[PDB]
Enzyme design. Sequence first.
Site, mmCIF file in Angstrom:
data_model
loop_
_atom_site.group_PDB
_atom_site.id
_atom_site.type_symbol
_atom_site.label_atom_id
_atom_site.label_comp_id
_atom_site.label_asym_id
_atom_site.label_seq_id
_atom_site.Cartn_x
_atom_site.Cartn_y
_atom_site.Cartn_z
ATOM 1 N N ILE A 1 6.027 -1.714 5.364
ATOM 2 C CA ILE A 1 5.041 -2.765 5.550
ATOM 3 C C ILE A 1 3.660 -2.133 5.742
ATOM 4 C CG2 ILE A 1 4.249 -4.449 7.251
ATOM 5 C CD1 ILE A 1 7.519 -3.952 5.265
ATOM 6 N N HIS A 2 3.116 -1.633 4.642
ATOM 7 C CA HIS A 2 1.807 -1.003 4.675
ATOM 8 C C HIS A 2 0.744 -2.003 4.218
ATOM 9 C CE1 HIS A 2 3.279 -0.121 0.546
ATOM 10 N NE2 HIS A 2 4.361 0.364 1.222
ATOM 11 N N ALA A 3 -0.502 -1.554 4.260
ATOM 12 C CA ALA A 3 -1.615 -2.396 3.855
ATOM 13 C C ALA A 3 -1.224 -3.183 2.603
ATOM 14 C CB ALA A 3 -2.857 -1.530 3.636
#
Length: 89
Positions: free
Chosen positions: A14-16
């Site tokens: 769950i990155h940018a």
Amino acid sequence: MEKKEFHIVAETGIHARPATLLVQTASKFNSDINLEYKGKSVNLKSIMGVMSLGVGQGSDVTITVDGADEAEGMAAIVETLQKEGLAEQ
């Protein structure tokens, strides 16, 4: 006022990218939609809160939707969750 739980199936982190993907879709509703991971529910678009939280490795989380968009709001998130392989149905 309706919440929708889920789990990260992207195992990405769950990155940018995926992080915002949900927040971007969650933080774009006239309703109250947020994400809850481990039990912490915050405006997914809440980098600060999310940051400290954040998911990925099959990490499970919970989404919430309250208001008009509630339906549409979560609808996207939900769909996106499984649409972006970020979370399952």
